[PDB]
DNA sequence: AAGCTTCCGACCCTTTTTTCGGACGATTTAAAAAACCCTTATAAATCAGCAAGTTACGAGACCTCGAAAAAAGAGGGTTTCTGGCGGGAAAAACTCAAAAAACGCTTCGAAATCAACCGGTTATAGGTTTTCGGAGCTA
């Protein structure tokens, strides 16, 4: 089955007990939420091994609906793009 | 006159100190015993170096007992080091719950993509050098 935030919690919090683990969850989320920030205001997010984790933009278009297919216009927006670091690629690459 | 209380004399018994006598030791003096001297020509000892045979004194050894010293064993005590148990506070699992947040339905058309190779970006592993904190110290 799938690893989820909730589990990770418990996990690091077995692996790195000698923490408390309500610092733990308490680092956890704001990572997560400094990391959503840096996104939100137009960041980078670099790292090594890993791999970074960044933007991309979109341009507004006349998309519309699968269900009604009824025109709706679209505005110029950002999204987040995620690539893996060769580290972590070869991690996963079985 | 009677009863109570307090001295006083008589005495009984044992311990402590003094005096006297007796005994023993030491010293002195006198008496007794052993000894020294004076007469001897003749008999026996003196001694010379070495051999041949023997031993009185020394050395070695062991035992025996007793005592002395040392070591062990015992007992008295104090200081401290550790372990077990008990108790309060914090953490984190456990139980109870909502509200988001994701997922699916479900996308035809818009990105995402990998591939190889160049130059360029930059997070950061690793190392290098240094303020802050604490060492307590001392009255």
């Given at each position: 089955?799938?690893?989820?935030?909730?589990?990770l919690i418990?996990?690091?919090?077995?692996?790195?007990?000698?923490?408390?683990?309500?610092?733990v969850?308490?680092?956890?989320?704001?990572?997560?939420?400094?990391?959503?920030?840096?996104?939100?205001?137009?960041?980078?997010?670099?790292?090594?091994?890993f791999?970074?984790?960044?933007?991309?933009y979109?341009?507004?278009?006349?998309?519309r609906?699968?269900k009604?297919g009824?025109?709706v216009?679209?505005?110029?927006?950002?999204?987040?793009?995620?690539?893996?670091?060769?580290?972590?690629?070869?991690?996963?690459?079985?």
């Open positions: 089955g799938p690893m989820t935030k909730s589990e418990e996990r690091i919090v077995t692996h790195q007990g000698q923490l408390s683990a309500k610092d969850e308490l680092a956890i989320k704001t990572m997560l939420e400094q990391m959503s920030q840096a996104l939100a205001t137009g960041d980078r997010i670099e790292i090594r091994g791999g970074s984790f960044s933007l991309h979109r341009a507004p278009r006349v998309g609906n699968p009604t009824e025109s216009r679209l505005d110029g927006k950002f999204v987040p793009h995620f690539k893996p670091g060769k580290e972590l690629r070869d991690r996963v690459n079985e």
